[PDB]
Amino acid sequence: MEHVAFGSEDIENTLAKMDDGQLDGLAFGAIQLDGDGNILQYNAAEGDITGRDPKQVIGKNFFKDVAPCTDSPEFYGKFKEGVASGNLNTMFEYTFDYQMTPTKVKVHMKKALSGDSYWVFVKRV
Ligand SMILES: *C(=O)/C=C\c1ccc(O)cc1
Numbered sequence: 476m477e478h479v480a481f482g483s484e485d486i487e488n489t490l491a492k493m494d495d496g497q498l499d500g501l502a503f504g505a506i507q508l509d510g511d512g513n514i515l516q517y518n519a520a521e522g523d524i525t526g527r528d529p530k531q532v533i534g535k536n537f538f539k540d541v542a543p544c545t546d547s548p549e550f551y552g553k554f555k556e557g558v559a560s561g562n563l564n565t566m567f568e569y570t571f572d573y574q575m576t577p578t579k580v581k582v583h584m585k586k587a588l589s590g591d592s593y594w595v596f597v598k599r600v
Contacts, residue, residue, distance in 0.1 A: 504597030
């Protein structure tokens with residue numbers, strides 16, 4: 476288990492040194508999106524929550540194909556705004572319900588230390 480807490484203020488610095496292998500050790504879901512919403516990373520933990528096979532969704536558009544239930548002003552709206560503005564740090568509850576049992580979750584989104592990469596952290600509530 477990779478000892479990193481959900482909601483840590485310096486999470487993006489800590490996660491900068493993790494490979495996909497290390498990323499699977501987190502106690503929470505972690506997805507890495509590019510500026511266009513394509514999945515660059517998607518760890519085992521999130522997969523436990525959504526049922527998705529991590530290595531299968533990589534390279535696919537999240538908002539378009541993986542998780543259409545996040546295609547809303549309440550989720551997709553903030554991401555694109557964050558991307559545009561060049562910064563993002565927001566926390567809010569949500570419910571994933573596409574092709575799965577409705578699961579109330581907490582979502583944390585924040586720009587990565589990298590230029591055009593963005594994190595989506597997910598935990599059960
Ligand atoms: C809403 O988000 C529904 C499903 C879903 C699919 C994939 C991932 O990663 C999260 C949620």
